[PDB]
Design a protein around this ligand. Structure first.
Ligand SMILES: O=C([C@@H]1C[C@H](N2CCN(c3cc(C(F)(F)F)nc4ccccc34)CC2)CN1)N1CCSC1
Ligand SMILES: O=C([C@@H]1C[C@H](N2CCN(c3cc(C(F)(F)F)nc4ccccc34)CC2)CN1)N1CCSC1
Ligand SMILES: *[C@@H]1O[C@H](CO)[C@@H](O[C@@H]2O[C@H](CO)[C@@H](O)[C@H](O)[C@H]2NC(C)=O)[C@H](O)[C@H]1NC(C)=O
Ligand SMILES: *[C@@H]1O[C@H](CO)[C@@H](O[C@@H]2O[C@H](CO)[C@@H](O)[C@H](O)[C@H]2NC(C)=O)[C@H](O)[C@H]1NC(C)=O
Ligand SMILES: *[C@@H]1O[C@H](CO)[C@@H](O[C@@H]2O[C@H](CO)[C@@H](O)[C@H](O)[C@H]2NC(C)=O)[C@H](O)[C@H]1NC(C)=O
Ligand SMILES: *[C@@H]1O[C@H](CO)[C@@H](O[C@@H]2O[C@H](CO)[C@@H](O)[C@H](O)[C@H]2NC(C)=O)[C@H](O)[C@H]1NC(C)=O
Ligand SMILES: *[C@@H]1O[C@H](CO)[C@@H](O[C@@H]2O[C@H](CO)[C@@H](O)[C@H](O)[C@H]2NC(C)=O)[C@H](O)[C@H]1NC(C)=O
Ligand SMILES: *[C@@H]1O[C@H](CO)[C@@H](O)[C@H](O)[C@H]1NC(C)=O
Ligand SMILES: *[C@@H]1O[C@H](CO)[C@@H](O)[C@H](O)[C@H]1NC(C)=O
Ligand SMILES: *[C@@H]1O[C@H](CO)[C@@H](O)[C@H](O)[C@H]1NC(C)=O
Ligand SMILES: *[C@@H]1O[C@H](CO)[C@@H](O)[C@H](O)[C@H]1NC(C)=O
Ligand SMILES: *[C@@H]1O[C@H](CO)[C@@H](O)[C@H](O)[C@H]1NC(C)=O
Ligand SMILES: *[C@@H]1O[C@H](CO)[C@@H](O)[C@H](O)[C@H]1NC(C)=O
Ligand SMILES: *[C@@H]1O[C@H](CO)[C@@H](O)[C@H](O)[C@H]1NC(C)=O
Lengths: 729, 729
């Protein structure tokens, strides 16, 4: 073979680019798609298009447009510019509204600058936005706003938006407002961070900044004071009739009010029925209320006969939180993924006023998500196919006959496609399938009426051609047996892989609770280069604590982070040695985030298995990480709860053992998530026992170390480190 | 040669210690010397001693005693404990006073905890101390203290102590209190930092600290708002229990009050005469006031006819600040080191009420300091001897006949001893000479009347014996000529140095204004180990900007930091690389603090001379460093003054040029002096141009990186880096 390899520069410079097909459904029949900067509208049934918005229309706008969104009625477009990222989901921007009829910009009563969130109503063209921590509503795009809240206060009171921990850990979103289905009501949460302690760290900014700024963020670490929450619903139809429309509070159940709790789900069921899920700070007890608008009293009442309890004896509730309900049209019943009697997550069907649900799926595999629901069918994604927990397929279950389950994606191309997600049109008339591996991504359109393939949207044939002329690595996905249990692993294997030879191995680690690092996804990444160019086998293993394989495995680390998931990585590397193609003198380990923690714990174990390793932005001590995530698995760091294990599971306590390995420690100085503190404490502990190691800080980079320059820099630095570690002198 | 070399562990574990002889003169005849925790009193004439304080007298004290301070009359001893370090000189402590005649601790009216500064009066046993930024006086150690100031406010108003910049850059002391010679009056300064911006940075503390704390220090960077100053004198003999003490203000001269200024010297001339020097923020103009107490008015009057102006056309005033005056017994005249018409610093004799002074010394060499003054002789240290700038000897000049200058140390032992300092007894009847190289330190005692060498106090005989068992490096001190100017260098040369072999060379740099890195001092340091064990030549060079050779050289970098001192290091290395015994493929550079700046500027020069280098806590951009030091050399960073050169002299602008060198960048995260910011901006600039480098932060270490464990870790890591840089294929 004399083809070039996939090199570091190929990775860093995006030589071989995966083609996507990102569409946005605007109705049951049409979607928007961007072609040469034009936004086209496509007819799903026939595949024909027209130009929805010419790439030239905003040449003289005066700013770069970061994103857009069309009002559901297609009458207006929201233009987003001046994008300034905040945390993982949050950002601020400027907004203009463009009238698609008059084909003109709206110049009056503009959405203000530094707006924190904006959303169209689900029908028509009402807008709700949050600015300086208060909610505002515009019935019409050109008319004055109605103020909804007056309590907003920077870093203290948040109306309609989440604080740091709710954004990161509870909602995975910045917005905390929820329009009712036809847009009459606006529901929202209000967060109060008054007594939440602040994390503080320096931000250096451009070199022109003479004094560094101190960034200050309300952030509860494990066992600290949490934000408190309240929930309100306002009738937006009353706004133009009343001076100051009342926000009606819906209070949490008595079973939540006894202690610290969270609001963890808000889902509208009908025009006049809302469901809310609450979670106790000890995250093994959750309560769903189902609340009806009382038209005579103007209030929202939650009948206790409609209250649903969800609890767990072996772990926490949900994968990362209680699952969302999917209501039938009439709002009298719902489906929900919950853990069955054998510990497998399956769809349960509830009547809103009956406490026992009926499971509609079962087996030793799990439902991943419910994707659409029509009067006749529920569509869901699972890992059932071929008993492969790292595969994903779309299924269709007949609501009038649960024995009728059709796999819609399994057989479409079984060699190329074992991992699917899906995007349904507005009332599920059409669906886009996204195949993401093990072959090249493939995007296809389908009609729900007959489940017929309409067309291939994107097959990545250009890329397939380019890759022919490259010595690509291959991927092996398989399992090993420990204590009568299957544990899955993957290997990125060098091209021309020869089982008779001995290769250096890099164990690529995440291993957090419900993680999955062994799967059928096609990836072009650093491991691609390491296998292709450096002849390194890059392996990953899903041990105890990993997800999508039932609660027995997932909850094995309950209250005991930093134990089995760490040991099982070491055991995996031993098993890979036994396999006879691994150079036992050249086994390395690396990971980012939770993976940095595990890497560090492994390097500090004294196992003798690993020559060297790299931790990027690691957790080092559970008391340093946020409350919601940490306590879910660890409970509270108090003498009476779990303090002893909090104190027993730190990186720092294993400092002496790092004498036996080569360690590289890396962290961004402006990481708001895993604070630089965490690595600062590892380095100090290594200094204190006289261990030499390598270190790199990334000025002003956060948890993603994702700026273009820092990304290239970190992977270049890590490559040098691995090459040196593995070099035969 | 089977002798051991001087190893890294030898340096790190202090295997070979220099013996000292630290004495404290208590009168014209006697000194105190700490010996095995016992404090002995010695008679200078005979060399006999008695015990003044047994090592066991405080066996039952309950605390480890940091330090001792015996009152001038020998009646009391101040006991210092609970020492908590603050900045370079500042710290807080607790104090008890032990009555030497009652043989008991004083338990009534104790000095409070967290006392910031304490000092005995110069005669007797009064005390002045600062606590919570206010001054208190105790007339007797068991009596209630009088409160002198009431305006003390943390981080804002400082009475009798310095703020950060005055401590670091003006006074080199935390103390801002000055007793009159017999203790009648107590003069003090008051600093007001109201509008001085704060540097803020994180401190991580022990692992147990859940949230890092933010340190906030009022610290004026270049061009920022400076602290303001006021000066006061209080009569301590007329204090009342009933009414508040009255402090008399002495205001600065009009030529100072017109703009920003500093108080830079306070020196009592007589019991009733005090001199003050003030310096403009533009530090090329200073003025001395000489002020007399008016018994009639109780006021202090500074006659204009007694005002002395000192300015510079080529640079700033004084070496690091205007020099201190040395008054005669009657206070009617004084001697002061000032730059003469050739730019050489010599002793000038002033009459208090005449503008012209008379130079009493002259020549192409410099007086370093005035050490003692009697009616017949002034005693000073200079580098006159053998025309060697890096040598120091003690001289005396006959005040009746300036042609009569006698060297008192030059010929004592010219081979061993070329660098002296001196300590005189109260009326200059005796002196202790401290020889510090080129041979082993030698401490001797002398009587002034006929300059007899009375006795050897400490000759390091023991260490000499040990060192003969070790392959010690030698030192060459010599010069090169640049533009017909002599510039001095030193080389630490490996044992068995062979001029025909080729050695790698490490250039050890400081190169700050008035620095001197080429001298005759004997050192046991990191360089000793590099030469002795690793066979590396360690060179240092004193180029333009360096000290003790006149203003032509010293002021060559005026308004132009990061130019000629940087170029001259490159030029010296260039010249060294053309010597037969130097391997031009293995020349490295390193420096700390100002030396780290210069190392970085050199590595970023694109000279091609250096393979690698290490910068420890470097300055990177002059706008980040403090006002008093920076502006002394650079003026103000405004377009009207010197901003263009502030902007041209940064490390960050040279980032691209690092592509051809190996660089190690190191910095303590709690550096209050050269902020971590400075290195954070270097790393970000290197990342931005895609340059790979090595880095190390030191959690919670300051500018000295001097904790036992951090000191060992840094030197270990640097040694690995150099060894790797110098390893041959
Ligand atoms: O940053 C963090 C944590 C992780 C935590 N993540 C964990 C992964 N997580 C989730 C991942 C995925 C996947 F993958 F299926 F799509 N799906 C989710 C679906 C619903 C909710 C959460 C999901 C989203 C939130 C947020 N902060 N650290 C935790 C310890 S080390 C640093
Ligand atoms: O830390 C600093 C600066 C240096 C500055 N130093 C410079 C050296 N300096 C001085 C050194 C010496 C020597 F030599 F005779 F002993 N003697 C002095 C006699 C009187 C006053 C100052 C002196 C004491 C003050 C304090 N902060 N940086 C400057 C730029 S990089 C970091
Ligand atoms: C809309 O009604 C709210 C609710 O009463 C008003 O907010 C209150 O204002 C008073 C006085 O300023 C405060 O003491 C209360 O604490 C506020 N309550 C809340 C929930 O914010 C608000 O001012 C009204 N807006 C207008 C324009 O009248
Ligand atoms: C959206 O749903 C809301 C809530 O049901 C509707 O508002 C109600 O409309 C009915 C008319 O059939 C009235 O009986 C009630 O007085 C209304 N209730 C409230 C709270 O306003 C609303 O009409 C629906 N909107 C649209 C556009 O269909
Ligand atoms: C320390 O300095 C500040 C000025 O920096 C003084 O505060 C000023 O005092 C004047 C007169 O009383 C006021 O009119 C100003 O408003 C103050 N200025 C600022 C910026 O606050 C303060 O009095 C000084 N303190 C002492 C003890 O001298
Ligand atoms: C220290 O010197 C001061 C200042 O000269 C002395 O105080 C003066 O002493 C004279 C002579 O007795 C008095 O007449 C003056 O009125 C005093 N002046 C002031 C301002 O107090 C003081 O006595 C001396 N102290 C010692 C211990 O010698
Ligand atoms: C102190 O230094 C400043 C700055 O170099 C000198 O001010 C300069 O003086 C002349 C005019 O007399 C011009 O070259 C510049 O316009 C001035 N520069 C600035 C920045 O103002 C000043 O003369 C020096 N003082 C002394 C006594 O030498
Ligand atoms: C697609 O084709 C049909 C004609 O058969 C037409 O009615 C429809 O408007 C077209 N859609 C677009 C988006 O061009
Ligand atoms: C705009 O659209 C046309 C295709 O109709 C294309 O030629 C052009 O590249 C697009 N982008 C521009 C002009 O920036
Ligand atoms: C937020 O909580 C604090 C209690 O710590 C309370 O004083 C304050 O009024 C609350 N503000 C609200 C709910 O707007
Ligand atoms: C929730 O967790 C705590 C700690 O494990 C436990 O004491 C409590 O009983 C748990 N609840 C359930 C339902 O198991
Ligand atoms: C030293 O000896 C003399 C007598 O020769 C005596 O007066 C003096 O006190 C002694 N000094 C000390 C400090 O022991
Ligand atoms: C200093 O602290 C100790 C311990 O708290 C206390 O007992 C003592 O009285 C304090 N000293 C003074 C002078 O206040
Ligand atoms: C002295 O001055 C301070 C404030 O300036 C005052 O509080 C105190 O009472 C005064 N004491 C006397 C005795 O006048």
């Amino acid at each position: 073979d004399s083809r070039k390899t996939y090199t570091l520069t190929d990775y860093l410079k995006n030589t071989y680019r995966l083609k996507l097909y990102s569409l946005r459904w605007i109705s049951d029949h049409e979607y928007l798609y961007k072609q040469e900067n034009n936004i086209l509208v496509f007819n799903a049934e026939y595949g024909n298009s027209s130009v929805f918005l010419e790439n030239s229309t905003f040449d003289e706008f005066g700013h770069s447009i970061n994103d857009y969104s069309i009002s559901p009625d297609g009458q207006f477009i929201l233009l987003e510019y001046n994008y300034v990222k905040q945390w993982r989901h949050s950002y601020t921007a400027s907004y203009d509204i463009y009238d698609l009829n008059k084909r003109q910009l709206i110049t009056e009563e503009r959405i203000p600058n530094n707006t924190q969130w904006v959303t169209w109503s689900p029908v028509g063209h009402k807008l709700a936005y949050v600015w300086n921590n208060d909610i505002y509503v515009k019935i019409e795009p050109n008319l004055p706003s109605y103020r909804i809240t007056w309590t907003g206060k920077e870093d203290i009171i948040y109306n309609g938006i989440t604080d740091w921990v709710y954004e990161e850990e509870v909602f995975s979103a910045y917005s905390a407002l929820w329009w009712s289905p036809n847009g009459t009501f606006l529901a929202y949460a209000q967060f109060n961070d008054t007594e939440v302690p602040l994390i503080e760290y320096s931000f250096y900014s451009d070199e022109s900044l003479q004094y560094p700024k101190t960034v200050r963020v309300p952030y509860p670490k494990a066992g600290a004071v949490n934000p408190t929450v309240k929930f309100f619903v306002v009738n937006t139809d009353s706004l133009s009739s009343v001076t100051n429309a009342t926000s009606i509070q819906i209070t949490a159940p008595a079973s939540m009010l006894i202690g610290d709790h969270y609001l963890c789900d808000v889902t509208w069921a009908t025009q006049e029925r809302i469901s809310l899920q609450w979670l106790r700070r000890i995250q093994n007890y959750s309560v769903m209320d189902i609340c009806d608008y009382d038209e005579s009293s103007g209030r929202w009442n939650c009948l206790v006969a409609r209250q649903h309890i969800e609890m767990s004896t072996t772990g926490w509730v949900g994968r990362f939180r209680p699952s969302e309900p999917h209501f039938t049209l009439d709002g009298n019943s719902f489906y929900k993924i919950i853990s069955n009697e054998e510990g497998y997550r399956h769809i349960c069907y509830f009547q809103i006023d009956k406490k026992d649900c009926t499971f509609i799926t079962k087996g030793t595999w799990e439902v991943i998500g419910i994707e659409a629901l029509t009067s006749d069918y529920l569509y869901y994604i699972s890992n059932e196919y071929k008993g492969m927990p790292g595969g994903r397929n779309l299924y269709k279950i007949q609501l009038s006959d649960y024995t009728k389950v059709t796999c819609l994606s399994c057989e479409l191309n079984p060699e190329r496609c074992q991992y699917y997600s899906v995007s349904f049109s507005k009332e599920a008339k059409y669906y886009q399938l996204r195949c993401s591996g093990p072959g090249l991504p493939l995007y296809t359109l389908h009609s729900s009426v007959n489940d017929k393939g309409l067309r291939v949207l994107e097959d990545n044939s250009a890329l397939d051609k380019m890759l022919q002329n490259v010595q690509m690595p291959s991927k092996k996905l398989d399992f090993i047996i420990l204590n009568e249990t299957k544990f899955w692993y993957q290997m990125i294997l060098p091209p021309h892989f020869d089982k008779s030879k001995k290769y250096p191995l890099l164990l690529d680690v995440y291993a957090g609770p419900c993680s999955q690092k062994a799967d059928t996804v096609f990836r072009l990444n650093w491991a691609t280069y390491l296998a292709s160019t450096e002849n390194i086998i890059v392996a990953s293993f899903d041990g105890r604590g990993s997800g999508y394989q039932g609660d027995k495995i997932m909850h094995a680390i309950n209250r005991r982070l930093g134990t089995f998931e760490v040991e099982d990585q070491i055991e995996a590397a031993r098993q890979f040695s036994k396999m006879g193609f691994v150079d036992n003198k050249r086994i390395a380990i690396w990971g980012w985030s939770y993976g940095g923690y595990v890497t560090s714990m492994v390097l500090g174990s004294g196992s003798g298995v690993f020559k060297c390793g790299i931790a990027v932005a690691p957790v080092s001590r559970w008391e340093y990480y946020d409350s919601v995530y940490t306590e879910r698995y660890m409970g509270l760091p108090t003498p009476e709860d779990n303090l002893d294990h909090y104190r027993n599971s730190t990186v720092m306590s294993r400092a002496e053992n790092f004498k036996q390995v080569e360690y590289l420690l890396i962290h961004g100085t402006a990481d708001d998530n895993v604070h630089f503190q965490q690595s600062a404490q590892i380095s100090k502990a290594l200094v204190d026992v006289g261990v030499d190691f390598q270190a790199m800080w990334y000025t002003d980079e956060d948890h993603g170390i994702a700026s273009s320059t820092a990304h290239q820099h970190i992977y270049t630095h890590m490559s040098h480190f691995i090459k040196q570690c593995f070099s035969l002198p």
